[PDB]
Design a protein around this ligand. Structure first.
Ligand SMILES: Nc1ccc(C(=O)N[C@H]2CCC(=O)NC2=O)c(Cl)c1
Ligand SMILES: [Zn+2]
Length: 105
């Protein structure tokens, strides 16, 4: 149970080793303005994504950070967001836990 893949297509996305405790915990339960609730896991690093659009600070769950939508680069499924423009760390990923599949190397 080391590697996280895209649940839809199996694209390699991230590792458990790259979990990042932002503000005390790697898991944050959040809701967007459309009322959708997400369990978001924070990662220092990710791969196999495609970041779409320019960064936006509107409705950012993480103070000091602007967000870009992160799609699965393979199948185009929305996996979360990339965060940038902040400090300690400058950038990180917030990925939707239930859209990932955990398994071995
Ligand atoms: N009409 C919509 C529908 C959904 C959204 C959304 O998911 N927004 C996220 C972006 C990442 C974040 O940190 N906070 C959010 O709220 C937005 Cl901004 C407008
Ligand atoms: Zn995928």
């Amino acid at each position: 149970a080391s590697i996280f893949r895209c649940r839809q297509c199996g694209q390699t996305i991230s590792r458990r080793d790259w979990l990042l405790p932002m503000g005390g915990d790697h898991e944050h339960v959040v809701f967007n303005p459309a009322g959708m609730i997400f369990r978001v896991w924070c990662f220092s690093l990710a791969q196999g994504l495609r970041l779409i659009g320019a960064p936006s600070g509107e409705f950012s769950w993480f103070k000091g950070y602007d967000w870009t939508i992160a799609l699965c680069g393979q199948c185009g499924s929305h996996l979360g967001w990339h965060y940038e423009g902040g400090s300690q760390p400058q950038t990180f990923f917030g990925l939707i836990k239930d859209r990932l599949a955990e398994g071995p190397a």
